[PDB]
Amino acid sequence: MEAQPQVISATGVVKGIDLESKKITIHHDPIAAVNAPEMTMRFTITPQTKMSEIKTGDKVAFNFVQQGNLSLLQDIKVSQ
Ligand SMILES: [Cu+2]
Incomplete structure (x- = not known):
């Protein structure tokens, strides 16, 4: 419908x-x-995720798709 x-x-x-x-x-x-506030969430690395080098405390830009209860990462990289 939309x-x-x-x-x-x-x-x-x-x-x-x-x-x-x-x-x-x-x-x-x-x-x-999606009108979301700040939230801590778990994101899933699949074999199709395009991973870059990351570590805890890094600010990141990332893209994901929801599959039921999972948020599957498309990609993630360090961002400014
Ligand atoms: Cu969220």
């Missing part, structure tokens, strides 16, 4: 990286497109 956000773009700060469970915990800045 447009559905598929890819959500956001910025935030990395708070945890767990490469066993393939989970990056990010405290994201408000996200206008």
Whole structure:
């Protein structure tokens, strides 16, 4: 009936990286497109994610898709 956000773009700060469970915990800045406030959320690294080098405390720009309870990363990189 109308447009559905598929890819959500956001910025935030990395708070945890767990490469066993393939989970990056990010405290994201408000996200206008979805009317979200600041939130800490878990994002999933899949084999299709385009990863860049990141570490806890890095500000990042990232894009993800929601799949049920998962937020699957399309890409993530350090940002200004
Ligand atoms: Cu959120």
